[PDB]
Amino acid sequence: MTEGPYKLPPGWRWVRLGEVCLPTERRDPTKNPSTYFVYVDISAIDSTVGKIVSPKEILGQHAPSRARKVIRSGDVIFATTRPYLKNIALVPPDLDGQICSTGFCVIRANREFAEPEFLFHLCRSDFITNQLTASKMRGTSYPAVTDNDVYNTLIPLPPLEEQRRIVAKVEALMERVREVRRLRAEAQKDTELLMQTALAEVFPHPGADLPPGWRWVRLGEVCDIIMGQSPPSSTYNFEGNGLPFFQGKADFGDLHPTPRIWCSAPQKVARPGDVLISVRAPVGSTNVANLACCIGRGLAALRPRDSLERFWLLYYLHYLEPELSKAITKKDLQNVFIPLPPLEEQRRIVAYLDQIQQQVAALKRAQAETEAELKRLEQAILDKAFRGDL
């Protein structure tokens, strides 16, 4: 209504960006051929945080044709090409009187109405991007975004004092985001070390001391071992005839293999529970069977006897992966020594390792890629800022 795009706190007002900007000028550095100037092009900007980080000092003689807009301390420069990339930055004082590409719209705050830092953060918002119509679907001969298009966008305008307060809150919030990323990185490192340390303790070299009552056994003693075989070609089908067939490591998923092809003549069978292990090319890699299935040349299946927990075996094989990864013969597998606690202690220790393993996995995923996390979290902060909610 009278409220504009959305309702602002008391005392704020809606204006076009241009209404709080000043005129800007151009200069041809080639007119002082022996004079160095500093040039800010698109490549000079880190779009993730909106900072001029790599401008180039250039001899006037060699000024690029786009090098014509004079920038001043506190200007915001806003690329009119691909605006969604956020090549948008605040000009520091060291760059006063230097030059940026004509590809930037130069937004110079009229300090009677707007703080440069407030304009900078405002201009990084999707709220501005989303107003630039020439960025949306284009028909024949539609012009690209112009400087006037940018100056014409609507912006919420608090009093100067509140602008400065909002700038401080936005910058502090963004710094906390960085702090958390660093912390996560540290946790990832320490948690991985924890897992590695825990496995090394419970899985000592054969013959090493084990708590009384544990025994060193050969896997063959507490595990049925089945070497996979290639059935006759022509017994494979996709009609669900027989059992899913897994040739080798390639046919393994994150934890369990997913059925792709069947074999009507199941030769070597693995059941739910059994651990699958690659005995071929990438030796030692592991999965667990979740369905009755059959295995080929590339796999062995290990079926724990009653004195051995599936997951104790799995952790051990994973811990041994570097050794196992130098084919693998039945006798090899049967001859592997494993320390064997009573079932209750295997389960107690597996519960502990499971907690760490889940934490390592979570920490791995919780670290989002940098450019995306920073740009989209920035946007969520700006949305709060420009509604008056900070």
Residue numbers in the entry: 1 to 326, 335 to 398
Question: What did the authors write?
Answer:
Restriction-modification (R-M) systems maintain the integrity of bacterial genomes by cleaving foreign DNA. Type I R-M enzymes are composed of three different subunits: a specificity subunit (HsdS or S) that recognizes specific DNA sequences, a methylation subunit (HsdM or M) that methylates target adenine bases, and a restriction subunit (HsdR or R) that translocates from the recognition site and cleaves DNA at variable positions. The HsdS subunit consists of two globular domains that correspond to the variable target recognition domains (TRD1 and TRD2) and two conserved regions (CR1 and CR2) that separate the TRDs. M2S1 is also the core DNA-binding component of the R-M enzyme. Together, the M2S1 complex recognizes an asymmetric, bipartite nucleotide target containing two specific regions 3 to 5 bp in length that are separated by nonspecific DNA sequences of 6 to 8 bp.
We report here the crystal structure of HsdS from Thermoanaerobacter tengcongensis in an open form conformation at 1.95 Å resolution. TRD1 and TRD2 exhibited very similar folds. In TTE-HsdS, the CRs were found to be composed of two long antiparallel α-helices, forming a coiled coils motif. The two helices were held together mainly by hydrophobic interactions and four hydrogen bonds. A three amino acid loop (Gln375–Glu377) is inserted in the CR2 α-helice. And there is a fifty degree bend in CR2. Although both TRD1 and TRD2 have similar folds in the three HsdS subunits, the overall domain orientation is quite different. Compared to the EcoKI-HsdS computational model, significant bending and twisting of the CRs in TTE-HsdS crystal structure enlarges the angle and distance between the TRDs and also shows a small range of rotation between the TRDs. In summary, the crystal structure of TTE-HsdS shows an open form domain-orientation. The potential open state model of the M2S1 complex was proposed based on the structure of TTE-HsdS.
